[PDB]
Design a protein around this ligand. Structure first.
Ligand SMILES: CN(c1cc(C(F)(F)F)nc(OCCC(=O)O)n1)c1cccc2c1CCC2
Lengths: 13, 214
């Protein structure tokens, strides 16, 4: 259920 | 060298910046976004499965943040420097009712980092060891994480022996701050859970997500 951490880890840059 | 100390230092240098407990909680939330960027620059972290990257950062974030503001604060007398540019004096921390845990941070971490002149490569390596925590529950492959931890402490020891050949005990001294960092992490978490429960303090969304159950 860890929305924010999943989103930040997936995003490359 | 599948784990070069140069890359670990680069990660540290890339991310380098009344209720005191309100300022502390705002700073923690802000630094959680920076911690994800830091972790992505540690060699081989981003090649772990995404579920394992999540478990490692959920296991370690409080220790990783405590390690960073503690090293940041070595130039400060009787206080800590937050990433937000703000100082919490031990007197403010005592007046906010978190004196005892604040003094533990000053005495067991900040003072000891100051006395041995722990350098940013050493700090980076200790933080990489915390991050690669093979005891973290639910890892898909704890052996892979253990292997990454071993490579960090192999590189750290070689760096210590080369850079500080006069201090044979320095490697062991670095590693023996980790029990203090563990104990202080758990106590800081207990404080945070209390602030959330009493509702006395605003908790922003990333900090709040890190306090939600697994
Ligand atoms: C300053 N502070 C913390 C404790 C924690 C942690 F526990 F969640 F990891 N996180 C932060 O991040 C600040 C980030 C920064 O500015 O670099 N700050 C602290 C220090 C001593 C006592 C207490 C506290 C927060 C709870 C009680």
């Amino acid at each position: 259920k860890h929305k924010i951490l999943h989103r930040l880890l997936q995003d490359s840059s | 060298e599948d784990m070069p100390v140069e890359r670990i230092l680069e990660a540290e240098l890339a991310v380098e910046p009344n209720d005191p407990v309100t300022n502390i909680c705002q700073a923690a939330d802000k630094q959680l976004f920076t911690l994800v960027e830091w972790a992505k620059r540690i060699p081989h972290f981003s090649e772990l499965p995404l579920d394992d990257q999540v478990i490692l950062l959920r296991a370690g974030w409080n220790e990783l943040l405590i390690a960073s503001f503690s090293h940041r604060s070595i130039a400060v007398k009787d206080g800590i420097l937050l990433a937000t540019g703000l100082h919490v004096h031990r007197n403010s921390a005592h007046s906010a009712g978190v004196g005892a845990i604040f003094d533990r941070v000053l005495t067991e971490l900040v003072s000891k980092m100051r006395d041995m002149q722990m350098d940013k490569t050493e700090l980076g390596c200790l933080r990489a060891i915390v991050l690669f925590n093979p005891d973290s529950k639910g890892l898909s492959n704890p052996a892979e994480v253990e292997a990454l931890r071993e490579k960090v402490y192999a590189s750290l020891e070689a760096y210590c022996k080369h850079k500080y050949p006069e201090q044979p005990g320095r490697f062991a001294k670095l590693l023996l701050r980790l029990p203090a960092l563990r104990s202080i992490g758990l106590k800081c978490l207990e404080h945070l859970f209390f602030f959330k429960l009493i509702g006395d303090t605003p908790i922003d969304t990333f900090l709040m997500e890190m306090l939600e159950a697994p």
